[model samples]
Target: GMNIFEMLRIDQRLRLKIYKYTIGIGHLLGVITKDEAEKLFNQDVDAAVRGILRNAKLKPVYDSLDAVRRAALINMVFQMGETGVAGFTNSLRMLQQKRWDEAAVNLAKSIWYNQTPNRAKRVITTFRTGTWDAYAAHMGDLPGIVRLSIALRIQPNDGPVFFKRTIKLLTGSSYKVEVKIKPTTLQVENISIGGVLVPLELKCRVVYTGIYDTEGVAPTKSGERQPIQITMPFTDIGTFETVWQVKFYNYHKRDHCQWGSPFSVIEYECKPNETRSLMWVNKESFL
Candidate 1:
C-alpha cells in the first residue's frame, strides 16, 4: 500500500508475486480487461494436443479411441497440464491398451475428480463408453427467449470434424443411437439423449444418409420418437435453468485430422419467438 499507481506500471521485475496475484483476482472478477480469455483457452487446447502427441513409443491410443474420448483427454490435459496427466502412467497405459474402463478408473483417482466432479464425470463417461453421453451444449439461463433455430455448414469435406449439441428440456427428452454412416462404423449403441427438453423431443439432421432411432425415454409430444436425420439439428438455445452444450465430435487420429487454431463454441443473439439465431462459428480443415 505504499507507492500506489506509478509502481504497478513501472518496474514489476520484483515484488512480482503480489503484483501478479492482485491482477489475477481482478481479471477473474472481470474488473480488468483480458478480452482474449476464450481465445487463450482454445490456444491452450492446441498446446495440450501438441504436448500429448509428443509422447513416447505409444501410438495405439491414437488409433483405437474415438474422437469423443480423444477430445476428452485433450481437455483433461488442457486443464491438468502436461505433466499432471502424464503422472497417470498406468492410466496412460490403459488408454494405450484400449482398456477404456480401467483407464477411466485410474484417471478418476486424481484431485481433479474432487475439484470438478461434474466435468470429470462427463469426460470420464465418454472415455469409458466412447459415446456422447452427458454430451452437448447444456443451455443455461433464459433472460428473454422463446423459440430456437440452428444452421450448420461444414467445409471442404476433408479430414474429419464432428459437432454435437444437446438442448435439454425445460420441463421434459432418451434417444438411442443406431447410426451406420459408413459400413462397420457403429452398432446398436444406446445413447441416452433424455431429459433433453419438455416432452423429450428428438431432432436429427445429416448431410449424409444415416438411419438412427430413439428406443424409449418417456412421452414426447407425440408419444413416439422420430427417426429422421437432418442437415440441421436442435436450435432452442435459451434457458437459465438448463444447459445448451455443443461439442465438436472429432473421430480421427491427430495426424489424420486438421491442424490449426481451433474455433470457439456456438455464438448467438436473442430475439422473441425465434429464441434468437444460434450457430457455431466453427471452421477448420485438415491437410
Candidate 2:
C-alpha cells in the first residue's frame, strides 16, 4: 500500500479534503498552536511571492528595485495573482524601464487605488520617489511643481516627443490646465495630471487636431501647420503635475524613423484657494 504522504501528494482533491478535515479536528482538540499556524502562513506567503516572480518573468527586474518597491510589486501579485498584475502593461513597462515616477502615477490611476486609497498611496509614494519618509511627510499636503531645466530638441526627421512633469496645488478648488503642442504632426500618447490619467469621464478633451500625413511621412510645407491642444481639469486639493510624454514615428525618413525629444517645460504655477488655471503652450513648431 502506498504511504499516506505519497497518496496525498498524488491526489490534490483528496489532499485538500484531508487537510481541511485534519485542520478542523486539530482546532477542536487545540492541537494546532498559534506558532504552527503562523509558520504555515509565512510559508504560504513566501511560496506565493516566488510563484509570482517566476510566473511574471520579473525575477531579473525584481532585484533592481528598492525594498519597499519590491514589496509593493510582490504585494500586488500576491493579492491579484500573476495574470491580474500582468494587465498593468504600461505600468509594468515603466517599472522595467526604471521610470519610477511614471510607474507610480500609472498605479495611482488604477481601480485598485480607488478601492484601497491608503494602501495604494503608500506604495505609490515609494514607487515615485523610492522613499517612505517622503510619502509620510507629504501625506496630507498637495504636490509641488517640478521645474525641469532640460531643453527638448526635436530634430527635423524625429518622431514625437515624450516628457513628464509634476505639479502641486496648495488649495482645493476647481482648476484647469491647457496644454498646446505645435508642429501639428505630433501625437499624444498619455498624459497624467494631478495623479489622475487623462480621458477620465468628460474631464479631458482634444481642443485641436492638426494636419498629418496619412502615409506616416512628414507633411508638405502647406500641410505642416498642424497643432494639437488638450485640456485637463483638477478638482482635488493636493500637489500634482502633468506627466507628459509623446512618441514620434515618421516613416518617411530612413535614419530618423523613431527619434523623439524630452519634455520642454513652460511657465506653470498655482496658488492657494485660487480658481485660476495655467497653460503650457509650446509655441515653437519643429521642422
Candidate 3:
C-alpha cells in the first residue's frame, strides 16, 4: 500500500494530474495525510499476502520459505498487484526452484527494473542474499511478517487450560502478533493474558488487536475459507492488561499455512502478577 506519490516525491502539479485523471477525486488530492496513507498501505499488504497465497501453484512453495524471501515476495506484490507479480514467470520459476541468485538476476531483466530502481534494488538484493538488509523503517516491516508470541495452546488430555509467554518486540518494527489455539476443535475454555510494558525507548505503539475465529466458517474440511477474524483500531504505547476468553470452533482442518502467509513477535517482559517475580526477555530480529 505505497503512496507512490509520496515515496517518489511526486511534484504537486503531477499529484493533481494523477488523481484527476485516474479516479476523479480532485478534492482529495491534497487532503489526505501521510499517516492515513501508510495506514491504508498496511491493509494493502495484508491483501497482498492473501493474493499471493491464492495462487494455487505458489502456496506450497511459499509456505515453506524463509522470512526474508517471504517478505521480499510480499513487497513485490505490494508494489505490483497479484496479477502484476504473477507475470514474472521466469523469475518466479527460479524462485520456486530455490535459485536465489538466478531469481534475482532474472527479475532484473524486466521493465520494472528501470521504473523504481531504489526499492526494486532493495527487494532484489534481499531475495538474492536472503536477509532483512533491505528492510526500511518506513515500509513498516512489510506486511507478510507474523511472529508467534506466547502460544496459548490447547491440549487433548489432562492439562492446564491456560498459560502465557512473551514476545519481546523491537523499536521501528510493526508486528501482527496472533496466539493460536492449536489443532482444530469445536470448543475449549482457554484464555491468554496479554499486556505490554512501557518501553525504555518509547515511541507510540499503534496496534490492532483481535481474534481469528472459526465459527461458521466454510472450506474448513475442504480448505478454502479463512476464519472470521476481527479488526480493532489503533492503540497506544503504555501499560495495559487485556484478557480473552477463547472458545475455538471447527477451524480450517489445515492451518492457514495450508492456505497463506508466513508466520513469525515483540520483545516484551512482564510478570503475571505483582510479587510473582516473573520476567520474559525475547531478543529477536528479522534474522
In candidate 2, how many Å is residue 8 off? 31
Q: Candidate 3 local accuracy as lDDT?
A: 0.41
Candidate 1 C-alpha lDDT tens digits along 10-32: 11111112344433211211232
Per-residue lDDT, model 2, residue 286, is 25
In candidate 3, what are the lDDT values of residues 133-243, reduced to their tens digit? 543333322111122233211222211122112111112222223332111221122222322221111112222232322223222223232222212111221121233
Query: What global local distance difference test value does model 2 have?
Result: 0.42
Against the true structure, candidate 1 reaches a TM-score of: 0.38
Report, for all candidates in order, the number of backbone clashes.
Answer: 27, 16, 11
In the order shown, the candidates' Cα RMSDs to the true structure are 21.7, 20.2, 20.6
lDDT head-to-head 1 vs 3, winner? 3
Better of 2 and 3 by TM-score: 3
Question: Candidate 2 on 66-177: residue-level lDDT in tens?
Answer: 6666766665664456677767888877887899888988898999888756556666665677655423333223212212111222343332333212111111122232
